[PDB]
Amino acid sequence: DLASLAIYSFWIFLAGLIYYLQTENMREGYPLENEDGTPAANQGPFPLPKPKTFILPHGRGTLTVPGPESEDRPIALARTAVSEGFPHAPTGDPMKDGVGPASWVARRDLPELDGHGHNKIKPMKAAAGFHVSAGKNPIGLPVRGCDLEIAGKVVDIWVDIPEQMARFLEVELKDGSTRLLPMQMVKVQSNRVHVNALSSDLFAGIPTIKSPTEVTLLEEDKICGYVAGGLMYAAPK
Amino acid sequence: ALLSFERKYRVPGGTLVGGNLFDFWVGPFYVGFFGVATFFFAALGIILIAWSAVLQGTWNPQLISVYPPALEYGLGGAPLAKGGLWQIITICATGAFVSWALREVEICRKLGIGYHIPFAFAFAILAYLTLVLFRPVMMGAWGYAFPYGIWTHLDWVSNTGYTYGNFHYNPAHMIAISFFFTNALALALHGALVLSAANPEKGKEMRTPDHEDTFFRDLVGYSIGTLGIHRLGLLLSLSAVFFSALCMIITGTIWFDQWVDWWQWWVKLPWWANIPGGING
């Protein structure tokens, strides 16, 4: 029967489709490793995908995946048990070491570029015509931590020009320096900006950026990682 | 085993119950208190299904069917073989689904991310609870819930539906369907767009988000944006399930007739109700 041949054929096609999808989804992180970093014996029934290349715009080079996988950065963690399956505890300051919920990835120390080769993210004071068009404007507002103490004041807004959206709030600290705060980790209010992830004294520990007009992917990851990590490492305060 | 970048994330903490007593993984799976709880409920639920199968006299997954108590049992407990199994299995499932959600929450805490996922999963649980608990309770009997059988639960959908004529006329059902269709449309478009940007024409450099925007702008005159599309996808699928639970929680509780009759608040309207002509005149 045709209907019978059809459905039978579809299930064959589907098994082949799933096989393809799973291997496509192994272009990052595989092969699997033992907790000591060495390759793991069991890699599953699905084989490693064959290399594919991405030619990045603006002479940024080419990415090949799968490929030599390495965390080009030290990991301040230690095994908690002999066997596998147990937590690895931070050897130092998780927040400062960038581990656990405060982890960051060694991305390119370059700014994400827009389609025309310009910095994607930029402080409003450097983006002609950008302004708050709705909602409360956090600029000039005090930034308060989970300790209820004021850590500083909002001196600017870093916007994703292409998407026209607020991504970072630049906060000036007592020492007079500034730090970027992810927009999705703050709560803008009528009189202040509340940050539940950090305590006022921890804002200084937020990794700093080199240029005052741009931010690299590497820095964005350190900033975001550090801030999100406060939810677990700055909660006691 | 671990993904090459996973180790730095497998730190202690994030639990809601049991401190570090269950703070560990089994293979890739995180356990946690809710993990052992899920295993418990799931194991007991599966064992009871197997028991119901021994009673049914079949091992075929196509025939095994666990029916709820008869309507005569109202909301009371029933004997294992006559619906009790369905009642206990329903309790185990609810415990398993809820525990699964709380386990996700712990996972969210350990990774320091938002709780959007378990929050979203809760809508599905509420939809399940609507058909198996809320509606049955409001109608006065567990027997109004669906049976646990691959094909028998479809017959249930059919019988329940036709009990009200053509279910297509349930206005809340229309809305849910529109969200379901619009969702699949949006998922297809979003997957396509990203892929078309990351895997451009041959002989071209990987596209940027701007190309995605320009594409949808040229095509339909508006780009919701990278953030917007994920927000929309979540909203479409959640709204679909919401209107699903809604179209069922009102059927047989505040509505009892053929759903097509509902549309009279528009047709039989006093004035034009009698104007000659059209389809209803």
Place this chain on the structure above:
Amino acid sequence: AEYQNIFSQVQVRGPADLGMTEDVNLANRSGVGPFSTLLGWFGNAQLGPIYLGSLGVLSLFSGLMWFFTIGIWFWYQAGWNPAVFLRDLFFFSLEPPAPEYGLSFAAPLKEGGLWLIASFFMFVAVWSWWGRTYLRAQALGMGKHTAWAFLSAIWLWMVLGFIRPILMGSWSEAVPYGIFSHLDWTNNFSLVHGNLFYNPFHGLSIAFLYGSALLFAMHGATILAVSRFGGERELEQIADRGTAAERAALFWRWTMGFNATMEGIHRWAIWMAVLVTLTGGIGILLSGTVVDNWYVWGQNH
């Protein structure tokens, strides 16, 4: 409580983005439209510009004619009475020619001929639009994933209104142009073929339709959960994996035992959705042409 990033807290507005040029013929790109603060709370506020080429205009022209043919017919059914028009709007229906006419085009206007005319226009409108989704991607140097995914939806539509009717021998088998009437056609179609629940392709189609809501809920929530690390910027995460892509992957690996990649999740997405209409088209195409009763068919196989 915490912020959820479902709606923006503070909207920002700057110069309108005219878009990438690439090989797009700017001669057909309109000017920029106004900003919608209302839309700005959920997504972007910029409206337009839009592109209109020869194919788009043709598509718009045909589409409007399709709408005009159905509308004019509705007025006729309403007796040109505005009141009757608004009350029976959803009850009006432009039905296909009766069976007697087979696949003939000789059906009288008031008895199916107008349906054929409306279908001609819809056929041109859809395919022209399909060519357009292909051309818009080509001009920007993008892959043709959108045109291919669109072909899947078009496939179900082609089967419902043209392919199956032709193999069945009459236009009477096609779907009528009416809100409630096409709903009744759908219900009748199932009763006539022995319960569509037993059409395995319908079952698969449901699994993917349900699976699409499951997958987008999973994906939408996941990206929002890691938006605090710039997760929504998926293309860059693909080019240079960040903690956002890693945390998202680990959340799922720890939850269900396996995960995706920032790029691979979109292949899962495009296929989950595409399979909906793909399997659905097959199931409908096989109905009445090869299988008359699905329930019965299923008991024997």
